[PDB]
Protein backbone atom coordinates (compact mmCIF):
# COMPACT_ATOMS: atom_id res chain seq x y z
CA UNK A 1 0.00 0.00 0.00
CA UNK A 2 2.24 2.78 1.29
CA UNK A 3 4.91 3.94 -1.17
CA UNK A 4 8.38 2.73 -0.25
CA UNK A 5 10.92 5.21 1.10
CA UNK A 6 13.76 4.27 -1.24
CA UNK A 7 15.65 7.46 -2.08
CA UNK A 8 13.91 10.69 -1.11
CA UNK A 9 14.68 14.11 0.38
CA UNK A 10 12.03 15.97 2.38
CA UNK A 11 12.20 19.76 2.59
CA UNK A 12 13.11 21.50 5.85
CA UNK A 13 10.61 21.82 8.69
CA UNK A 14 9.26 24.79 10.65
CA UNK A 15 7.64 25.63 13.99
CA UNK A 16 3.90 25.99 14.55
CA UNK A 17 4.52 28.45 17.38
CA UNK A 18 6.10 31.86 17.97
CA UNK A 19 9.44 31.94 19.79
CA UNK A 20 8.97 32.21 23.58
CA UNK A 21 11.76 34.74 24.16
CA UNK A 22 9.78 37.13 21.96
CA UNK A 23 7.63 37.87 25.00
CA UNK A 24 9.91 38.88 27.87
CA UNK A 25 6.91 39.02 30.21
CA UNK A 26 4.95 35.99 29.02
CA UNK A 27 8.33 34.27 29.14
CA UNK A 28 9.77 35.24 32.52
CA UNK A 29 6.37 34.32 33.96
CA UNK A 30 7.14 30.68 33.17
CA UNK A 31 10.75 30.91 34.35
CA UNK A 32 9.46 32.42 37.60
CA UNK A 33 6.45 30.15 38.14
CA UNK A 34 8.00 26.98 36.73
CA UNK A 35 11.66 27.94 37.18
CA UNK A 36 12.26 26.91 33.57
CA UNK A 37 11.48 28.09 30.04
CA UNK A 38 12.84 27.58 26.53
CA UNK A 39 14.66 30.65 25.22
CA UNK A 40 14.91 29.90 21.50
CA UNK A 41 14.65 26.80 19.31
CA UNK A 42 16.02 26.90 15.77
CA UNK A 43 15.62 24.28 13.04
CA UNK A 44 18.36 22.73 10.90
CA UNK A 45 18.90 19.92 8.40
CA UNK A 46 17.37 16.79 9.90
CA UNK A 47 18.30 18.37 13.23
CA UNK A 48 17.24 21.02 15.75
CA UNK A 49 18.80 23.30 18.35
CA UNK A 50 17.58 25.34 21.31
CA UNK A 51 18.63 26.82 24.64
CA UNK A 52 16.63 26.43 27.85
CA UNK A 53 16.74 28.78 30.83
CA UNK A 54 16.66 27.83 34.52
CA UNK A 55 16.59 29.58 37.90
CA UNK A 56 19.75 29.55 40.02
CA UNK A 57 17.84 27.96 42.90
CA UNK A 58 20.42 25.27 43.68
CA UNK A 59 23.89 24.25 42.53
CA UNK A 60 23.18 20.87 40.93
CA UNK A 61 21.01 21.17 37.82
CA UNK A 62 19.61 18.58 35.41
CA UNK A 63 18.30 19.57 31.98
CA UNK A 64 16.98 16.95 29.57
CA UNK A 65 14.78 17.37 26.50
CA UNK A 66 11.99 14.85 25.96
CA UNK A 67 11.07 14.29 22.31
CA UNK A 68 8.88 11.66 20.66
CA UNK A 69 7.83 10.61 17.16
CA UNK A 70 5.02 8.21 18.08
CA UNK A 71 2.11 10.25 19.44
CA UNK A 72 4.01 10.37 22.73
CA UNK A 73 4.62 6.62 22.80
CA UNK A 74 8.37 6.26 22.29
CA UNK A 75 10.36 9.16 23.76
CA UNK A 76 14.05 9.44 24.62
CA UNK A 77 15.77 11.47 27.34
CA UNK A 78 18.44 13.56 25.62
CA UNK A 79 21.15 15.17 27.80
CA UNK A 80 21.55 18.94 27.47
CA UNK A 81 24.87 20.79 27.24
CA UNK A 82 26.16 23.96 28.90
CA UNK A 83 26.81 27.24 27.10
CA UNK A 84 29.46 29.76 28.17
CA UNK A 85 29.10 33.10 26.37
CA UNK A 86 29.06 36.79 27.29
CA UNK A 87 25.36 37.00 26.41
CA UNK A 88 24.48 34.05 28.65
CA UNK A 89 23.02 35.28 31.93
CA UNK A 90 25.45 35.65 34.82
CA UNK A 91 23.11 34.31 37.51
CA UNK A 92 20.83 31.99 35.54
CA UNK A 93 22.75 29.39 33.54
CA UNK A 94 22.04 28.56 29.90
CA UNK A 95 21.79 24.95 28.73
CA UNK A 96 21.64 24.04 25.04
CA UNK A 97 20.29 20.95 23.26
CA UNK A 98 20.86 19.33 19.87
CA UNK A 99 18.35 16.70 18.76
CA UNK A 100 18.63 14.83 15.46
CA UNK A 101 15.33 14.70 13.56
CA UNK A 102 14.03 11.27 12.47
CA UNK A 103 14.81 9.78 9.06
CA UNK A 104 11.47 11.03 7.72
CA UNK A 105 8.22 12.58 8.92
CA UNK A 106 4.78 12.31 7.31
CA UNK A 107 1.24 13.30 8.26
CA UNK A 108 0.63 9.88 9.81
CA UNK A 109 2.29 10.43 13.19
CA UNK A 110 2.54 13.25 15.73
CA UNK A 111 5.80 14.81 16.93
CA UNK A 112 6.24 16.92 20.06
CA UNK A 113 8.83 17.63 22.75
CA UNK A 114 8.99 19.06 26.27
CA UNK A 115 11.55 20.42 28.74
CA UNK A 116 12.46 18.63 31.96
CA UNK A 117 14.37 20.63 34.58
CA UNK A 118 15.27 18.94 37.87
CA UNK A 119 16.41 20.95 40.89
CA UNK A 120 15.79 21.51 44.60
CA UNK A 121 14.33 18.02 44.75
CA UNK A 122 11.71 18.99 42.18
CA UNK A 123 10.77 18.18 38.59
CA UNK A 124 9.64 21.11 36.45
CA UNK A 125 7.95 20.14 33.18
CA UNK A 126 7.57 22.86 30.54
CA UNK A 127 5.62 21.57 27.54
CA UNK A 128 5.62 24.37 24.96
CA UNK A 129 4.82 26.79 27.78
CA UNK A 130 1.23 25.76 27.11
CA UNK A 131 0.30 22.46 25.48
CA UNK A 132 3.02 21.04 23.23
CA UNK A 133 5.68 22.08 20.72
CA UNK A 134 3.84 21.10 17.54
CA UNK A 135 6.52 20.78 14.86
CA UNK A 136 5.27 20.89 11.27
CA UNK A 137 6.97 20.96 7.86
CA UNK A 138 7.67 24.08 5.81
CA UNK A 139 5.78 22.80 2.77
CA UNK A 140 2.73 21.90 4.86
CA UNK A 141 2.29 25.37 6.35
CA UNK A 142 -0.43 27.17 4.39
CA UNK A 143 0.09 30.78 3.34
CA UNK A 144 -2.86 33.14 3.84
CA UNK A 145 -2.66 36.74 2.68
CA UNK A 146 -5.05 39.68 2.82
CA UNK A 147 -4.75 39.69 6.61
CA UNK A 148 -4.39 42.64 8.97
CA UNK A 149 -1.92 42.64 11.90
CA UNK A 150 -3.16 42.76 15.49
CA UNK A 151 -2.14 45.37 18.07
CA UNK A 152 -3.22 46.27 21.60
CA UNK A 153 -2.43 48.65 24.47
CA UNK A 154 0.40 48.13 26.96
CA UNK A 155 -0.73 46.86 30.37
CA UNK A 156 -0.02 49.43 33.06
Swiss-Prot record:
The keyword Transport does not apply. Highly expressed in the liver and, at lower levels, in skeletal muscle, including in vastus lateralis, gastrocnemius and soleus (at protein level). Highest mRNA levels are observed in skeletal muscle, and only moderate levels in liver and heart. Weak expression in placenta and lung. GO terms for molecular function: [phosphorylase] phosphatase activity; glycogen binding; protein phosphatase 1 binding; protein phosphatase regulator activity. The keyword Phosphoprotein applies. One of its GO terms (cellular component) is protein phosphatase type 1 complex. Disulfide bonds: none annotated. Residues 28-136 form the CBM21 domain. Acts as a glycogen-targeting subunit for phosphatase PP1. Facilitates interaction of the PP1 with enzymes of the glycogen metabolism and regulates its activity. Suppresses the rate at which PP1 dephosphorylates (inactivates) glycogen phosphorylase and enhances the rate at which it activates glycogen synthase and therefore limits glycogen breakdown. Its activity is inhibited by PYGL, resulting in inhibition of the glycogen synthase and glycogen phosphorylase phosphatase activities of PP1. Dramatically increases basal and insulin-stimulated glycogen synthesis upon overexpression in hepatocytes. The N-terminal region is required for binding to PP1, the central region is required for binding to glycogen and the C-terminal region is required for binding to PYGL. This is Protein phosphatase 1 regulatory subunit 3B. The chain holds residues 105 to 253 of 285 of the full protein.
Amino acid sequence: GSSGSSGAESESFVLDFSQPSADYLDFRNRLQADHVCLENCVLKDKAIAGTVKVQNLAFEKTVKIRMTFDTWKSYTDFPCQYVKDTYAGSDRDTFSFDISLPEKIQSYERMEFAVYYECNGQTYWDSNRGKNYRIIRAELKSTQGMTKPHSGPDLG
